Every structure is written in C-alpha cells, then in structure tokens.
C-alpha cells in the first residue's frame, strides 16, 4: 500500500499546484478581458459621438465627452494586478501610459508558466495596441472642441482600425481563458480518479 501512496501523493501535489496556477492565471486573464471590454465600449461610444459630430457650442460639448472617454481609457490602460501593469510589460516603476498616449512601461512581456509547462503572456507591452487608441482619442477631443470638422473623418477611420485591434486582442484573450478552463476541467476529472 505504501508504494502506491508515494505515487498518488506525488500526483496529488502536482495537481494542487496546477489548480493554484490555473486560479492565479484566470484572475489575471479575467481582469485583462474586462479591461479590454471596457476599452471596446469606450471606443464604440467615441465612434458614435464622432458620427454625431459629422452629422457651434454643441460640437464642443461632444468634444468634452470624448475627453471623459480619453480619461477612462487611460485609466483602463494603466490597470495593475499582482504588482505589474497588464499593458506595461515588465516594469511597474511608472504608469505605463500618459494622457498623451506615450508609453513609459517595460520593454518586454512577462510570461507565467503553469506547473505542467504551459506558458502564456501574463503582462504585456501594450504600446502598439493602446498608444494609438489614446492618441486618436486625444486628437478627436481637440478636433471637436476647436470646431475642426475636416480632421474628424480621418479620425473616425483611425478609431475604427484601433477598435479592431482591441477586438482581436479581446478574442485572443478569450481563447487563452478557454484553454485555462479546459485545463481546470481536465484536472478536476483527474483529481476524482486519484481520490
Ligand atoms: Zn514527489
Ligand atoms: Zn489582485
Ligand atoms: Zn523604484
Ligand atoms: Zn519558457
Ligand atoms: Zn470569458
Ligand atoms: Zn472559470
């Protein structure tokens, strides 16, 4: 009986660690996905308000609300969990994005690795994804509050391409979450056998 118990306990300890690794990972991934959805919603609203703008004091008011959206998106781009920025890669000394869209985060991604070898990017350099999001929102807000109508059609298209960038990331992140959820279900089925 003792010999069998060595094997069952060894496996059970690997399973426990993997369960914690999956729980930790799903928290970072959920936060990431929720932040991305919050950005998608913001850019959607920015698009809508810019259509209104394209369709004197009132163009400026639209410009104002786009400014609130710019602030919300900068807040969202600076989301931090477990000591690191999810869109600021491997440095957390500074906020990774300014209100101007300048990136001051870490150059490299931070990888996490499950007990069984599976690796994913937990904290990423988000400059290419979010710097242009923010820069576009900023030019949108200024174009509107300065009554600059000619600038708006270009910026509408810029925001559409930026949003497609955020949608594709949301989808990649959804996929990683689905994988984690499959790993959990596999481990649960394996736990039942052991016990
Ligand atoms: Zn062991
Ligand atoms: Zn936390
Ligand atoms: Zn320091
Ligand atoms: Zn590796
Ligand atoms: Zn999901
Ligand atoms: Zn779950």
Author numbering: 45 to 99, 104 to 243
What did the published study say regarding this structure?
Crystal structures for the truncated bcFlgL and xcFlgL proteins (residues 45–251 and residues 48–364, respectively), which lack ~45 N-terminal residues and ~35 C-terminal residues, were solved by multiwavelength anomalous diffraction (MAD) phasing and single-wavelength anomalous diffraction (SAD) phasing, respectively. Although bcFlgL and xcFlgL are orthologous, they structurally differ in the number of domains. The truncated bcFlgL and xcFlgL proteins adopt one-domain (D1) and two-domain (D1-D2) structures, respectively. The D1 domains of bcFlgL and xcFlgL are superimposable, with the same organization of four α-helices (α1-α4) and one β-hairpin (β3-β4 hairpin), although the β1-β2 hairpin is located in different positions. Among the flagellar components, the D1 domain of FlgL exhibits the highest structural similarity to that of flagellin, with a root-mean-square deviation (RMSD) value of 1.90 Å between the D1 domains of bcFlgL and S. Typhimurium flagellin for 140 Cα atoms. The D1 domains of FlgL and flagellin both contain a three-α-helix bundle and a β-hairpin, with a similar length for each segment. The FlgL N-terminal portion that is missing in the bcFlgL structure is relatively short (44 residues), and the terminal regions of FlgL are highly likely to form α-helices based on secondary structure prediction, suggesting that the D0 domain of FlgL adopts a coiled-coil structure that consists of two α-helices, as observed for flagellin.
